[PDB]
Design a protein around this ligand. Structure first.
Ligand SMILES: CN(Cc1cnc2nc(N)nc(N)c2n1)c1ccc(C(=O)N[C@H](CCC(=O)O)C(=O)O)cc1
Ligand SMILES: CN(Cc1cnc2nc(N)nc(N)c2n1)c1ccc(C(=O)N[C@H](CCC(=O)O)C(=O)O)cc1
Ligand SMILES: [Ca+2]
Ligand SMILES: [Cl-]
Ligand SMILES: [Cl-]
Lengths: 159, 159
């Protein structure tokens, strides 16, 4: 199935005009464990934001605009990128807003990392109904030597 | 010679334990390029945050409490930290807090990065008299989709 994974700050803020204000190695860690060995779908701005193709995953970039990298699979439509992942147990949608927005109704599971970071949001996560999903996992953590903010890892499943 | 390198926030606010609330890759590039192939002195709090020894740099941790590792040099004092590096041209004192004020008096160069991160903290980078330190290099930068904040690189010769 399709699952979306995201790091939402307060008010579902998932993105700024610039980089996000924090150093969260742990969530990059949590992010990888969950996407590793799966096809990842992202938009050209998430693509261009990461910089390099994620190792050990198949990258599918969605954009009605033409491809600029020989190493990644590019796509022009939603249903098109779906086929690009092929035959797989799960697909991970990494973002952002439009990608989440379009895929969400096809999403059967969630991977929310909640961060106590009040920031002014350029982009936000589609309002996910609090009773259309069940929490099957949650783990809370405080900021430590390497992470700037408190966070709570959480996976949800559609009801 | 003893040079100190640090990244500051408004009003000279520096890390204290948990990681700092920003994401600045250029400063780590700047940091590395200036500290590499050189002996770097640090306190215990910084060392946890780095979480491992710096590559191509002789890492010296200054502490009174038992050096819990056998890869890095652990010293108990300042005159003792100094020797650990031998006779090299430059010794970088990377911090933090306390480690900074114990070493500024012997210093002759400052490697600052002034950040537009309005952070609250208790530790301050030692107050430097600008009629005792001449500014030489100074280059401003804008925040981008990779660097979360605006920042300025600066170099102060001691005068
Ligand atoms: C734009 N970007 C955003 C990114 C980060 N965390 C998320 N976290 C969640 N929970 N969801 C997302 N969609 C998400 N996206 C990035 C940036 C770097 C890497 C990357 O190199 N990270 C690790 C490696 C960690 C490292 O050494 O930098 C990886 O291999 O997945 C991935 C995504
Ligand atoms: C917490 N910490 C202390 C730290 C961080 N930024 C600073 N920035 C400046 N200007 N000055 C300092 N004294 C300083 N100290 C760190 C954290 C990570 C690395 C690090 O991972 N290594 C860098 C960069 C490595 C990389 O980007 O791959 C390096 O010097 O090799 C260094 C210092
Ligand atoms: Ca339950
Ligand atoms: Cl995008
Ligand atoms: Cl310390």
């Amino acid at each position: 199935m399709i699952s979306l994974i995201a790091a939402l700050a307060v008010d579902r803020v998932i993105g700024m005009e610039n980089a996000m204000p924090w150093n969260l190695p742990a969530d990059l860690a949590w992010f990888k464990r969950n996407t590793l060995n799966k096809p990842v779908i992202m938009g050209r701005h998430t693509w261009e934001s990461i910089g390099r193709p994620l190792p050990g995953r198949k990258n599918i970039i969605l954009s009605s605009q033409p491809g600029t990298d020989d190493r990644v699979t590019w796509v022009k439509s939603v249903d098109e990128a779906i086929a690009a992942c092929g035959d797989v147990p799960e697909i991970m949608v990494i973002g952002g807003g439009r990608v989440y927005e379009q895929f969400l109704p096809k999403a059967q599971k969630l991977y929310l990392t909640h961060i106590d970071a009040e920031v002014e949001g350029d982009t936000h996560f589609p309002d996910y109904e609090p009773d259309d999903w069940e929490s099957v996992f949650s783990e809370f953590h405080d900021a430590d030597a390497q992470n700037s903010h408190s966070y709570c890892f959480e996976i949800l499943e559609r009801r």
